[PDB]
Amino acid sequence: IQCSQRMLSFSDALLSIIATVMILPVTHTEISPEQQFDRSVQRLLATRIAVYLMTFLIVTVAWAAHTRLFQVVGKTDDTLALLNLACMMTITFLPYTFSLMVTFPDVPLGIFLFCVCVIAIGVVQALIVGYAFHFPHLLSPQIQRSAHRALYRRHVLGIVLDLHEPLSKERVEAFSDGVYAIVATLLILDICEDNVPDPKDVKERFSGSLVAALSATGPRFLAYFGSFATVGLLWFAHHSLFLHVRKATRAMGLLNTLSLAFVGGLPLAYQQTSAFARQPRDELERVRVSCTIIFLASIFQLAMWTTALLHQAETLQPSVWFGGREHVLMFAKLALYPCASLLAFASTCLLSRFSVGIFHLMQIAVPCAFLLLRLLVGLALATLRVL
Amino acid sequence: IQCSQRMLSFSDALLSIIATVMILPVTHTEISPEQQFDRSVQRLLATRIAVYLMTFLIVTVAWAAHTRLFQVVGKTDDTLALLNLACMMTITFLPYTFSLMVTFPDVPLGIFLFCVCVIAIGVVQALIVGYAFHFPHLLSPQIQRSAHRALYRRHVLGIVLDLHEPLSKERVEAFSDGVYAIVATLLILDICEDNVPDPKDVKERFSGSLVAALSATGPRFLAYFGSFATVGLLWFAHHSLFLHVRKATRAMGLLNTLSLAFVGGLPLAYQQTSAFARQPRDELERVRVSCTIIFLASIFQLAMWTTALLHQAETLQPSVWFGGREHVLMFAKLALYPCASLLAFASTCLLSRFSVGIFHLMQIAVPCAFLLLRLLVGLALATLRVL
Amino acid sequence: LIPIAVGGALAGLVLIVLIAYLVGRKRS
Amino acid sequence: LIPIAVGGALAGLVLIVLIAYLVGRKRS
């Protein structure tokens, strides 16, 4: 009988991969052919994005169920590890089955297969529940101390077959880290896959000048740079926030899920923004899309912190309470990105023809603002203390 | 000043992704055209495998350097998180630059770029070291307790610009979990990407019979099933082993690196083994390849445990020492896979024409043997106690 | 066109965040 | 052909693992 930490970490890694699987078709999409084949390509792109969002939400629901199930189960043994492996294996099929269902809604086979997958997940979780309750010493201390465990043995089974409830903070952190890491390095995978200069390619087009062939692919490298920087800074904000949380609630979990779902779209936004169009109006539209995606990504982290503030008296560390030693700094740190993204958006309307340059300048502004945030907060508070 | 656990976990996830990036070209390869275009395709395949191995080893070396660097550095702050993000971003380029160098060895540009990447990693790690030693309270308790810290401030810098030394057990676990999770779900990504029946595809070839179109792709689903099962059970063995380790040494780290590098090849082995050939001799060869890959993967886990046994008196938990309560069970658990793989290999020579069926039967035998391992060990020991 | 409308939706989102923060402050 | 030779290399690997285990046992 051993601690279950590592098996839950492995399960969280698997769940991150499975949830974010369906992003690959979106980034691997036929991005931009000239002469505006959009009138027919945009239906495909929108279908792919919708499938991505739906699959991510479904897998997140499955992950939440898993987190609760192994919250009631405290310890692990050789049998529970294998049962959890079976549960993970059956979970891994949800994206493909959902995509098949949406692809062929009229044929009942897809819906039947999705139902089969859900039933399998439920059955395996029920087996885990039964195994745990058949051996009392595996349950969490609270459950096996209680005398009503008999009712819980059926209650949890009924669940597996509200906003104030706790989630596992550790598993929220693990899943969020997995998703952030997958997204940040998303479009370096394809660069490695297909962007190394072919010897014949350089020989014919670039007459053997490898430097010319390399520079021909600058835009995708720049897009990767921007995407990684933005996603890393969003993760930094998330990490700073969650270093100060005592307990995580279901509302915070839902807001985190929304934040991650919207974070997932940044690689596409940057790929498109560096996929230069024929005329600059499309470029302004691309910048607007990037700004709105970033705002949507970060506003939900800010919303999560504000929601936790409603019960700070129990939910947060004292250092972040109202009037705390770092409350102002935390608010500024979480509000930075939404402000910059919103201003970059508004610039497209107010100072349109300079907005692309303003977006580029904002990309450089935000990281430095994060780096000096404590110093700038101190300076601003010192200035405003006597006003 | 806050704990650095989560930032190291995120760094380990990023490093797993970066190290395993170059496997994608191997699995996305032009697997098997009939009439044996191997005479020219095998050079490409071997080049890709060599690049994968070299890049994985390089990224593992970088990860080990990072683990030591943040072993000397104990705590983290807002600045160290951003510096670590910069270090990770610069690390992410190693695979592409190495591939470019190997692709164009005569052109000095690739070698220069690789040197630039290495120098950048070193410079950023030196900046982290300087920042840490400029603020004493961030270092680990041992270093800031010592009075020779002045020498260490230059010593670690000299390192960043032996077998008995300790590694971070937590980071070994995290990196291994990342790699195992990436590999296990490796060839479901492509199934989702390109294996959903196209409406026109089923309409023309299969006359609208979606079931026929689905069954046309059975082999890849079966390959995914086998790959996930094998990799999950290997991870289970790794997890059971490392639940009983007090300290991890550099020799154990090297053996773990070899184990992971050889684990990475299983998806290709299974994809090929389900990529049925024209005649069964090639099938026997494919089974041999799968068996040898599995043996290479697991024998190094067994070797790691045996190496740790040499200093069990300090390295392992008492329960696994010689004569311990679980020593025999641990040995059997780690030796299972090598034995089955070796027997499956030998069958190809001794009982060749039944060897494919024996491989299939072994795939079912191993998981059940793991499930009942404690009971079977008890039974065998009871029988042999009086012989 | 829509850009100003979607910007207004963004403004509404930040406004609900602000009202949540102010409610928390008042509760204290 | 090679199959038996590579199998012998595998046997050598397991043999070095076994010798390591026996050395550890003897050290006790």
| DSSP codes of every residue in A255-281 | HHHHHHHHHTTHHHHHHHHHS--SSHH
C-alpha–C-alpha distance, residues B354 and A58, integer Å: 43
CA distances from A359 to A371, A373, B83, B213, B313 (A): 19, 20, 24, 48, 60
Chain B neighbours, 3+ Cβ pairs < 8 A: A, D
Residue of chain D with shortest Cα separation from B303: D17
Asked if A16 contacts A60 with a C-beta cutoff of 8 angstroms, the reply is no
Residue of chain A with shortest Cα separation from B86: A229
The 10 Å CB-count burial string (b at 16+, else e) for A78-99 is bbbbbbbbbbbbbbbbbbbbbb
Asked if A145 contacts A226 with a C-beta cutoff of 8 angstroms, the reply is no
Quote the minimal CA–CA distance from D13 to chain B in Å.
8
DSSP string, A41-84: HHHHHHHHHHHHHHHHHHHHHHHHHHHHHHHHB-EE-HHHHHHH
Asked if A264 contacts A23 with a C-beta cutoff of 8 angstroms, the reply is yes
Interface probe for A, chosen from B18, B92, B192 (most Cβ of A below 10 Å), is B192
Yes or no, beta carbons of B306 and D21 under 8 Å apart: yes
Residues in chain B closer than 8 A to D25 (CB atoms): 322
Residues in chain D closer than 8 A to B322 (CB atoms): 24-25, 28
How many residues are recorded in chain D? 28
Residue whose C-alpha is closest to residue A265's, from A240, A291, A239: A291
Chains C and D are in contact, defined as 3 or more C-beta pairs closer than 8 angstroms: no
> DSSP secondary-structure letter at A146?
S
Yes or no, beta carbons of B193 and A25 under 8 Å apart: yes
Nearest CB among D4, D10, D21 relative to B309 is that of D21
Residues in chain B closer than 8 A to D6 (CB atoms): 292
Tokens 């740790």 locate to: B308
Helix H segments across chain B? 5-20, 23-27, 38-72, 78-91, 94-103, 108-134, 141-145, 149-160, 169-184, 186-194, 199-204, 210-215, 218-242, 250-263, 266-274, 280-309, 312-315, 327-350, 355-371, 373-384
State the Cα torsion B177-B179-B182-B184 to the nearest 10°. -80
As given in the structure block, the two tokens for residue B335 are: 């030796």
C-alpha–C-alpha distance, residues A93 and A65, integer Å: 16
Residue whose C-alpha is closest to residue B181's, from A127, A181, A191, A25: A181
Chains C and B are in contact, defined as 3 or more C-beta pairs closer than 8 angstroms: no
SS3 B369: helix
C-alpha–C-alpha distance, residues B295 and C27, integer Å: 63
Interface probe for A, chosen from B2, B3, B6, B201 (most Cβ of A below 10 Å), is B6
Nearest CB among A193, A210, A229 relative to B104 is that of A210
The single-letter code of the amino acid at A69 is: L
Residue whose C-alpha is closest to residue B275's, from B212, B345, B223: B223
The secondary element (H helix, E strand) that includes residue A376 is helix A373-384
How many interface pairs between A and C have CB atoms less than 8 angstroms apart?
41
Interface residue ranges in chain D relative to chain B, Cβ cutoff 8 Å: 3-4, 6-7, 10, 13-14, 16-17, 20-21, 23-25, 27-28
Contacts of D22 (CB under 8 A, 6+ apart): none
Yes or no, beta carbons of D17 and B302 under 8 Å apart: yes
Method of elucidation: cryo-EM
- Biggest CA pair distance of chain D: 42
